[PDB]
Amino acid sequence: EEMATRARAASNLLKALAHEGRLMIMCYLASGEKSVTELETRLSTRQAAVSQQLARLRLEGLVQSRREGKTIYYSLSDPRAARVVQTVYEQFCSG
Amino acid sequence: DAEEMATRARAASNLLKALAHEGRLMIMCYLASGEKSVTELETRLSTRQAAVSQQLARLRLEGLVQSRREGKTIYYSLSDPRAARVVQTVYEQFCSG
Numbered sequence: 001e002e003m004a005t006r007a008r009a010a011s012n013l014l015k016a017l018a019h020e021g022r023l024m025i026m027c028y029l030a031s032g033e034k035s036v037t038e039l040e041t042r043l044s045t046r047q048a049a050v051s052q053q054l055a056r057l058r059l060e061g062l063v064q065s066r067r068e069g070k071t072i073y074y075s076l077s078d079p080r081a082a083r084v085v086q087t088v089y090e091q092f093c094s095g
Numbered sequence: 096d097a098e099e100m101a102t103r104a105r106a107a108s109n110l111l112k113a114l115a116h117e118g119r120l121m122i123m124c125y126l127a128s129g130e131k132s133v134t135e136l137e138t139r140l141s142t143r144q145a146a147v148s149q150q151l152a153r154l155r156l157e158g159l160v161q162s163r164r165e166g167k168t169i170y171y172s173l174s175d176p177r178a179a180r181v182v183q184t185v186y187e188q189f190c191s192g
Contacts, residue, residue, distance in 0.1 A: 011117045
């Protein structure tokens with residue numbers, strides 16, 4: 001059934017999103033593009049672990065990066081994931 | 096502050112962990128287009144009726160679905176309005192046309 005395969009793809013995205021450290025990154029990018037320094041400042045996660053979570057989210061296409069001189073800026077990339085995350089942001093992270 | 100943000104994102108993580116199960120989400124996706132009977136749920140799903148009722152029981156105890164009776168027909172729908180909003184966006188992004 002078509003409807004069934006769409007649920008599995010929705011299921012697989014929610015499995016990718018339902019990790020505490022990575023979602024915390026995603027939630028911070030939902031209010032907009034951030035530098036690596038600034039996720040590091042905001043997250044109490046260890047910085048080697050922030051860099052590994054960022055590499056994981058980038059490789060999965062959930063975030064993307066750009067360079068501006070020395071500065072690496074990250075933003076949400078996957079548009080369907082970004083839509084889910086923004087609704088999650090509005091429901092949990094908005095007071 | 097940053098500590099509150101982390102607590103809120105960890106709570107949001109907990110909802111997504113609850114939604115990220117294939118059979119249960121299949122139910123939630125079906126309820127996202129509106130109220131469904133148990134009969135038409137069990138029609139539409141490849142899941143066994145013992146397992147569908149186990150999935151409905153889990154979703155009910157999590158607060159994510161509610162049910163009402165009409166005669167012998169039981170109608171399930173979304174309950175938690177926070178989780179309903181997330182599910183509707185998931186429904187729009189993946190399950191819609």
